[PDB]
């Protein structure tokens, strides 16, 4: 994968390729849900699916409508792409299952790494998606040294 983590010590992995979702919306959802606790991310995705929270649009923010639900992230522009969230929800189900398989502690899991890459254009622009969940945790010169020696004797 992309990052030096995914060591089997305290990690679990999941990925998706050629997922039929827009690249830019998937990127914005990935950026937002990065670093959150795993169970915390789930309800947040449930909130976005049910319009009780919105994912900020930061890089691909062209023409987004301003909403009051983008206030928690400090931005003025927010949107609720539900297709990409459903793709992310399924991916997190699989990553959660892989965590079960390896045998971690699921209560303290965090989204350590998530990255969306462009896929062979087929037109739509598919997106490769990958998720990592894991756990948290001179010298002394002759004159300088001689002065150090004299001051050492001075204190005593």
């Amino acid at each position: 994968y992309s990052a030096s983590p995914a060591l089997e010590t305290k990690c679990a992995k999941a990925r998706g390729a050629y997922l039929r979702t827009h690249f830019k919306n998937s990127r914005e959802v990935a950026f937002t849900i990065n670093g959150m606790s795993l169970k915390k991310a789930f309800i947040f995705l449930d909130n976005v699916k049910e319009h009780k929270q919105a994912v900020p649009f930061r890089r691909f923010n062209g023409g987004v409508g301003r909403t009051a639900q983008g206030k928690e992230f400090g931005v003025t522009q927010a949107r609720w792409p539900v297709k990409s969230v459903k793709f992310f929800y399924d991916l997190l189900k699989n990553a959660e299952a892989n965590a079960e398989a390896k045998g971690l502690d699921m209560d303290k899991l965090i989204i350590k790494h998530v990255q969306v890459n462009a896929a062979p254009k087929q037109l739509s622009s598919p997106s490769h998606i990958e998720i990592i969940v894991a756990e948290e945790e001179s010298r002394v010169s002759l004159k300088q040294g001689a002065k150090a020696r004299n001051l050492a004797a001075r204190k005593a």
Partner: protein, 165 residues
């Protein structure tokens, strides 16, 4: 193969011409080293340096070589030097010991020498002999023992290019 023999350079060695006011028996300020700002009496005129000391009973500056470029020859009244011999101070007399290698360090190298062990008793005999032969002169003229005990330092509004030391 080649080992290019250096051409016979036509450079010789002549005695260094010290300044006019750097005569033996004068009082000068010390500008560098561990004793910067001290005032010390010049005993003898060496090849390049000045064999100079503050009376060790007065300020505690032992007999040292000092290069003449880091000396300000004050116009303080001269102290006689004919009463003390100065031939025993040579360049080899002041020189370091060998080193036996390019690198030596560590605090054990610091607990050695010090002003007790590698310091010979003959040096104190010379140092006390100098003090015996200069204290009567420094005592004769007023403020002199107090002048040498003090330290030289600049003040705000003190411009050295106008100060006549």
């Amino acid at each position: 193969y080649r080992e290019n023999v250096p051409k016979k350079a036509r450079k010789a060695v002549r005695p260094t011409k010290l300044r006019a006011s750097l005569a033996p028996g004068t009082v000068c300020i010390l500008l560098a080293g561990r004793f910067r700002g001290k005032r010390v009496v010049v005993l003898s005129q060496l090849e390049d340096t000045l064999v100079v000391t503050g009376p060790y009973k007065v300020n505690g500056v032992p007999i040292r070589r000092v290069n003449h470029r880091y000396v300000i020859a004050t116009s303080a009244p001269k102290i006689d030097v004919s009463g003390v011999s100065v031939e025993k101070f040579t360049k080899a007399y002041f020189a370091k010991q060998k080193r036996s290698g390019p690198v030596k360090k560590d605090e054990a190298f610091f607990a050695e020498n010090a002003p007790k062990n590698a310091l010979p008793a003959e040096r104190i005999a010379d140092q006390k002999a100098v003090d015996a032969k200069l204290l009567p002169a420094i005592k004769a003229i007023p403020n002199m023992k107090e002048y040498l005990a003090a330290s030289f330092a600049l003040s705000n509004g003190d411009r050295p290019h106008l100060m006549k030391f």
